[PDB]
Write a protein that binds this ligand. Structure first.
Ligand SMILES: O[C@H]1C[C@H](c2ccccc2)[C@H]2C[C@@H]3CNC[C@]31N2
Length: 186
């Protein structure tokens, strides 16, 4: 099936815990895959304007590891719960993608999660101003804008609202799209 196909593809890129013990400042993100109308979508947040770190940007759910987290996956799930109300039984963490190095002293670990069909996001307004879905296929033929430096623009056909997606967030979205959708019969 579509969801089993996705999982089996994603597993071939799983690095596991290989890089998880290194002495970095640690941050995790969740890449939430949602099935809707026969197709895969990714879920994104718009960060609250009132935050000190990264106000108003399009990001995946995530945040800084804390002493309670058993591992880097736990960080990603804790933060998704706090931001959009995603509960543990509503998500299956399928793999850990390549981590991103930043600022010489920081390591960001991405996990891909399959989201239960009865989940409905409850944006927490102290953390997140908006939550929206983008079809995974979009990231193979995106609408690109040069700020000269590449930014994606996505317009939701439901309401005509446009979102800007860039940086690490846009890089990871393209990666997941290639993994899952490259070389498939139609
Ligand atoms: O997901 C975090 C991770 C990064 C970070 C986190 C902490 C310190 C430096 C850099 C930067 C890039 C990402 C884009 N949206 C938000 C975001 N911010």
């Amino acid at each position: 099936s579509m969801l089993d196909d996705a999982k089996a593809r994603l597993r071939k890129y799983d690095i596991g815990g290989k890089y998880s013990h290194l002495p970095y400042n640690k941050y995790s993100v969740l890449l939430p895959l949602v099935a809707k109308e026969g197709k895969l979508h990714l879920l994104f947040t718009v960060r609250s304007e009132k935050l000190r770190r990264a106000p108003g940007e399009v990001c995946f759910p995530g945040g800084k590891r804390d002493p309670t987290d058993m591992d880097d996956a736990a960080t990603a799930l804790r933060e998704a719960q706090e931001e959009v109300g995603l509960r543990p039984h509503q998500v299956e963490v399928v793999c850990c993608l390549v981590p991103c190095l930043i600022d010489t002293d920081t390591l960001i670990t991405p996990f891909v999660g399959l989201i239960d069909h009865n989940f409905q996001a409850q944006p927490n307004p102290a953390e997140v101003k908006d939550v929206f879905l983008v079809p995974l296929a979009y990231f193979l033929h995106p609408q690109v804008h040069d700020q000269i430096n590449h930014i994606f623009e996505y317009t939701n056909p439901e309401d005509g609202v446009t979102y800007q997606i860039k940086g690490m967030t846009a890089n990871l979205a393209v990666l997941v799209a290639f993994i899952i959708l490259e070389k498939k019969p139609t």
